[PDB]
Amino acid sequence: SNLNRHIRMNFETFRSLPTLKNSIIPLVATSKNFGSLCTAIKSCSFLDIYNKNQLSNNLTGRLQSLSDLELAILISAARVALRAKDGSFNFNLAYAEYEKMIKAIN
Amino acid sequence: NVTTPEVAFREYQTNCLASYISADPDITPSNLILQGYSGTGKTYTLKKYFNANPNLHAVWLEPVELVSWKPLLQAIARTVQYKLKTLYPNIPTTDYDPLQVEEPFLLVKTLHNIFVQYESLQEKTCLFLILDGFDSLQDLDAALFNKYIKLNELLPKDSKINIKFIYTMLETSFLQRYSTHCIPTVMFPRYNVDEVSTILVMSRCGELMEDSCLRKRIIEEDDQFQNVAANFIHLIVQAFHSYTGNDIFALNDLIDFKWPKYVSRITKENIFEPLALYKSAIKLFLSTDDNLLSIISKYLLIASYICSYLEPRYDASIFSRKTRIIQGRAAYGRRKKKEVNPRYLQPSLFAIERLLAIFQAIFPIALREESLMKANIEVFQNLSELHTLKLIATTMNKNIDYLSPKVRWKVNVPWEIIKEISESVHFNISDYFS
Amino acid sequence: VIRKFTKKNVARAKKKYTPFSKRFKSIAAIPDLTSLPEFYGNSRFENKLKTTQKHQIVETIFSKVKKQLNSSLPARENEFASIYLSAYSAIESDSATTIYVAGTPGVGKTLTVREVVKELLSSSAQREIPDFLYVEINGLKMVKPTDCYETLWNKVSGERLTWAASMESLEFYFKRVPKNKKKTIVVLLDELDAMVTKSQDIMYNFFNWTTYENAKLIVIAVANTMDLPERQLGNKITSRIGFTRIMFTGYTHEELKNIIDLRLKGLNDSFFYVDTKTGNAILIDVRKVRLRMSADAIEIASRKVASVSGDARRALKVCKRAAEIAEKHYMAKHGYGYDGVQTVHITHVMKALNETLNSHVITFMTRLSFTAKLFIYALLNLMKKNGSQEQELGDIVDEIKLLIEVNGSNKFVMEIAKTLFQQGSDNISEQLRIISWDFVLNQLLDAGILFKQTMKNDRICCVKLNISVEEAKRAMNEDETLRNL
DNA sequence: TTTGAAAAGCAAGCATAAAAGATCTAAACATAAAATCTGTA
Numbered sequence A: 001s002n003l004n005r006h007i008r009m010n011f012e013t014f015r016s017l018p019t020l021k022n023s024i025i026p027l028v029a030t031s032k033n034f035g036s037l038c039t040a041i042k043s044c045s046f047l048d049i050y051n052k053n054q055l056s057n058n059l060t061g062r063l064q065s066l067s068d069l070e071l072a073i074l075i076s077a078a079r080v081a082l083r084a085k086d087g088s089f090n091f092n093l094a095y096a097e098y099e100k101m102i103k104a105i106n
Numbered sequence B: 001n002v003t004t005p006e007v008a009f010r011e012y013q014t015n016c017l018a019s020y021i022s023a024d025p026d027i028t029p030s031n032l033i034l035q036g037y038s039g040t041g042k043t044y045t046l047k048k049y050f051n052a053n054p055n056l057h058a059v060w061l062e063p064v065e066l067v068s069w070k071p072l073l074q075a076i077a078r079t080v081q082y083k084l085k086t087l088y089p090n091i092p093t094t095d096y097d098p099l100q101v102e103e104p105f106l107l108v109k110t111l112h113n114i115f116v117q118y119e120s121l122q123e124k125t126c127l128f129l130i131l132d133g134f135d136s137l138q139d140l141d142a143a144l145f146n147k148y149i150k151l152n153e154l155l156p157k158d159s160k161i162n163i164k165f166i167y168t169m170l171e172t173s174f175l176q177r178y179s180t181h182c183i184p185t186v187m188f189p190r191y192n193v194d195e196v197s198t199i200l201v202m203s204r205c206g207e208l209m210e211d212s213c214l215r216k217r218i219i220e221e222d223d224q225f226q227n228v229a230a231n232f233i234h235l236i237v238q239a240f241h242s243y244t245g246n247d248i249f250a251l252n253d254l255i256d257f258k259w260p261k262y263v264s265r266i267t268k269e270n271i272f273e274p275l276a277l278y279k280s281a282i283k284l285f286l287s288t289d290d291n292l293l294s295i296i297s298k299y300l301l302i303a304s305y306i307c308s309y310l311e312p313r314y315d316a317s318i319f320s321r322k323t324r325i326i327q328g329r330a331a332y333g334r335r336k337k338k339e340v341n342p343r344y345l346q347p348s349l350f351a352i353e354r355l356l357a358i359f360q361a362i363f364p365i366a367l368r369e370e371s372l373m374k375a376n377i378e379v380f381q382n383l384s385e386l387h388t389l390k391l392i393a394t395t396m397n398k399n400i401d402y403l404s405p406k407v408r409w410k411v412n413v414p415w416e417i418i419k420e421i422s423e424s425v426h427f428n429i430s431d432y433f434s
Numbered sequence C: 001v002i003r004k005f006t007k008k009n010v011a012r013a014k015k016k017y018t019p020f021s022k023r024f025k026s027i028a029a030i031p032d033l034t035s036l037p038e039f040y041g042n043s044r045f046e047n048k049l050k051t052t053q054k055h056q057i058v059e060t061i062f063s064k065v066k067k068q069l070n071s072s073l074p075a076r077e078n079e080f081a082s083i084y085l086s087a088y089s090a091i092e093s094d095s096a097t098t099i100y101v102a103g104t105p106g107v108g109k110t111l112t113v114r115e116v117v118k119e120l121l122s123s124s125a126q127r128e129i130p131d132f133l134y135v136e137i138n139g140l141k142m143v144k145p146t147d148c149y150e151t152l153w154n155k156v157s158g159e160r161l162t163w164a165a166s167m168e169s170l171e172f173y174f175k176r177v178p179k180n181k182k183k184t185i186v187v188l189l190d191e192l193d194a195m196v197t198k199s200q201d202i203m204y205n206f207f208n209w210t211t212y213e214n215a216k217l218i219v220i221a222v223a224n225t226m227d228l229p230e231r232q233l234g235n236k237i238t239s240r241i242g243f244t245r246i247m248f249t250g251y252t253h254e255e256l257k258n259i260i261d262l263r264l265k266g267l268n269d270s271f272f273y274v275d276t277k278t279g280n281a282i283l284i285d286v287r288k289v290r291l292r293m294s295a296d297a298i299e300i301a302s303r304k305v306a307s308v309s310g311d312a313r314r315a316l317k318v319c320k321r322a323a324e325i326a327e328k329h330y331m332a333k334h335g336y337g338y339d340g341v342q343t344v345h346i347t348h349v350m351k352a353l354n355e356t357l358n359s360h361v362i363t364f365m366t367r368l369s370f371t372a373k374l375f376i377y378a379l380l381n382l383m384k385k386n387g388s389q390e391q392e393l394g395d396i397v398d399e400i401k402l403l404i405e406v407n408g409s410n411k412f413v414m415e416i417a418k419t420l421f422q423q424g425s426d427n428i429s430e431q432l433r434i435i436s437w438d439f440v441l442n443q444l445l446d447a448g449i450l451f452k453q454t455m456k457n458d459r460i461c462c463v464k465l466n467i468s469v470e471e472a473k474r475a476m477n478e479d480e481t482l483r484n485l
Numbered sequence D: 001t002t003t004g005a006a007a008a009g010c011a012a013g014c015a016t017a018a019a020a021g022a023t024c025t026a027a028a029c030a031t032a033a034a035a036t037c038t039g040t041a
């Protein structure tokens, strides 16, 4: 069953019953009738939706909200930081890398 | 028994708020966290939820306006008993002074004293203390949030008033500091460009209806007006989304700055063809446009830039131009040029006397005419003023003695500012970096 | 008027500011303070914590044993004789002196000093010595270290003064007041290291008053360490304390036996009417039950405690814990509640001794989740790779990613990779940190297994093991999966 | 017109000064209840 799979995933990652309770509570509360609650506990699709929401402001989700100029500037700064030995950079070197990348793309 | 409002792209967040916030204190968590970055609709969704459920008793606090922990405690103790007065006006109370709260345990004692006089109420109730922007306290440390997590455990268990804390947070790392506490948290991710456009239309079109510039130009020259407002919003988004990102506030600023000039190019020929209106009003979709010393002092700044961005052991290879009576050779110069562009990095530190030597090397000019310029009172007064204007910095910033030989000097102007300074006196500084 | 800040919780005691040197017009005008009603001491809360029982509670056979072993002198006779002889000679010669006593915790310093002053008060009750005033000042029971000045003067005069006025009053009283108008004072300074401030004015004043000719003051200074004056005090105070210092050594096991069997004189090898309906035992349906503690059990407890510390509190608590374990086993098999021969033998004492010595740390890391143990395993691998006892968190992230992607033929890794990087969804995108990354990091920080540095860059922030590496590898070898790869 | 040769330039390695800041303390600044001092009465 899907609920056993979610319990197994919690046992491998968090091993915390309060963590599982924080996901079970809105699954119970957002149901509007008895059959909807039975479908929710049989499928646990809300647990997937909750798990997706818990990660949406992580580093992975924050990058997927960037614009093209934001992504280009971030890539340029990561290039300058990789080439540096202290991993340090400033706005001038990142802009130099950005204008070099835009020139070699166009 | 709660009403779920309809927020356009925050439907999951609204269902989560309905699942966590109720009048029953038994099935409500002690702490609740809403986490998201700026302009993600946290305040908007929380306000819509508490507007759809008037029976829920909410107290709103802005931790940014309080700055420190002690005014935050006093603000909690003030606003809780003010709300309890305005909620049950027939209950006789004692007005405790909120300035009596100076420590967290004093807040626990004061909240206990306030809550023991509402014990004649029938049902257990929830009081929601909303801290909108907890990690926006200028004075924040890592130990402050632990006190607010564990505050409910010090208040009486069988009280009629049971305080519930709703926190609003900006930073992911601040929230991840407290992950083992297992507080229920609802995340508000950053909006899509499509959602930003929809929110901008639905929140700014009616403000673009009754702007006096548009109607004044229609008189002096309703779905159609909505069409031209929405087309302006979509043109602003399509022109400046790479500049603003998914910032609602930056696009609101750009719309507010560029609406009247776009209005001032609407004609009777332009009112039905939007491509001709975009052609006439083109220059404000190409650039953002969101912006708003003596002879000795300029040459002292130029010499300070030269001192900071050139190595002192190449000095005699450039400025030395006097003839010799004794045999001698000047510096040959750099054998090969470096490829680092030193004006990209932070400036070097120099002494006063090298700055004076380079200053009189490059300052403009029979037997008593005194061709060179000495460093008199005016030069040192100008240098002191340059330190006052923060165009020159030292290593020491407080209790700095100017007169010590261990005190070093650096320029802090950008390259463009010193280029403007050098071209204002027609000095060719860009020769020295070639 | 408008105030820049407020102090609305100021609570100020009612203590006068005028010292004793201004209390009389001259030195010749000072009367006999022994014939003064408020001088030299010539319990209002004890009725607050009482209530009616409304129950008859069950006291089993082991309960009297557990009450007899509480902390609340067969082995301290030489130290008693030395302290008593010095204090007796100082009292009956009107001399001022300092007696220094040091020792490790629980070796009987406070008990010996209190019994010495009890026998001295018994001597002065029968007019063998002049009558004196006994004062206890415990340095760990003071809010401020200057409060000792407030305490001693209040014990001497009955006045309530502030601390600088109190210390001026004490200076005038010890220095200027004649001996024929005074009384001897014996002051016990317990926990002397707590009375050490930055400027050692309290220590200097207390030991310098004992060098005054008129003071009639005896200071018994009780300290943790033999060379506390040499470590923390100035040379003047070390000179004033003296060279003659009394060491209280830890107890040997014969003396710990003597203490324990002195606690068990009236119930060990004795009979009880047990009343097996309830188990409530009365000391001489109802059975006559002998109770004994094994002498070899006391032997092994005393030997272990005497080798480790010599602490009498530790030995009494070990025997009390053994009696508690035996009582729990006894009440388990009968269901007696609280409302033949029962013996506290060797194994109860051994289970009491080993329960303080077994480490939960390896047991704690054994029962962690897979991700926390994977964190610890990657940290150990980085520690053995680059040799550093401090690893960057980004290195740990890359090491965890490398161990997942290199051991991709392991069946457990096949089953758990989608959980670790996607939470088993196929609607969550692939993550840069594993699931529960910040959770297990914070968990190992709350447990004290890890130390982390205060930097806000997550990748270049460093992490250290606060526990032993041998314990960490022994925990990591117990797991079936991580001991394979 | 040449010509060796000394002044000048560059690098590797390392000892060491200096910068930045973490941590702390003294002192100026500020308030405040109890005791004490005037001070007529």
Ligand SMILES: Nc1ncnc2c1ncn2[C@@H]1O[C@H](COP(=O)(O)OP(=O)(O)OP(=O)(O)O)[C@@H](O)[C@H]1O
Pocket (backbone or CB within 6 Å): B007, B008, B009, B010, B036, B037, B038, B039, B040, B041, B042, B043, B044, B045, B170, B199, B202, B203, B248
């Ligand atoms: N879903 C939405 N529907 C309609 N309007 C919205 C929506 N989200 C945001 N807005 C509009 O944008 C404004 C900005 O949102 P809001 O103030 O809630 O952001 P926030 O996440 O609380 O920001 P901050 O951290 O800066 O306080 C709102 O006041 C509202 O006018």
Ligand SMILES: Nc1ncnc2c1ncn2[C@@H]1O[C@H](COP(=O)(O)OP(=O)(O)OP(=O)(O)O)[C@@H](O)[C@H]1O
Pocket (backbone or CB within 6 Å): C070, C071, C072, C073, C074, C075, C076, C103, C104, C105, C106, C107, C108, C109, C110, C111, C112, C259, C312, C313
């Ligand atoms: N010689 C002894 N005979 C009997 N009981 C003793 C003896 N020594 C110590 N104890 C017991 O141990 C307890 C601890 O002794 P005490 O308070 O005198 O220790 P201490 O040496 O002052 O230690 P600490 O430095 O921890 O204060 C006593 O209250 C008493 O119950």
Ligand SMILES: [Mg+2]
Pocket (backbone or CB within 6 Å): B042, B043, B132
């Ligand atoms: Mg807000």
Ligand SMILES: [Mg+2]
Pocket (backbone or CB within 6 Å): C109, C110, C190
């Ligand atoms: Mg003691």
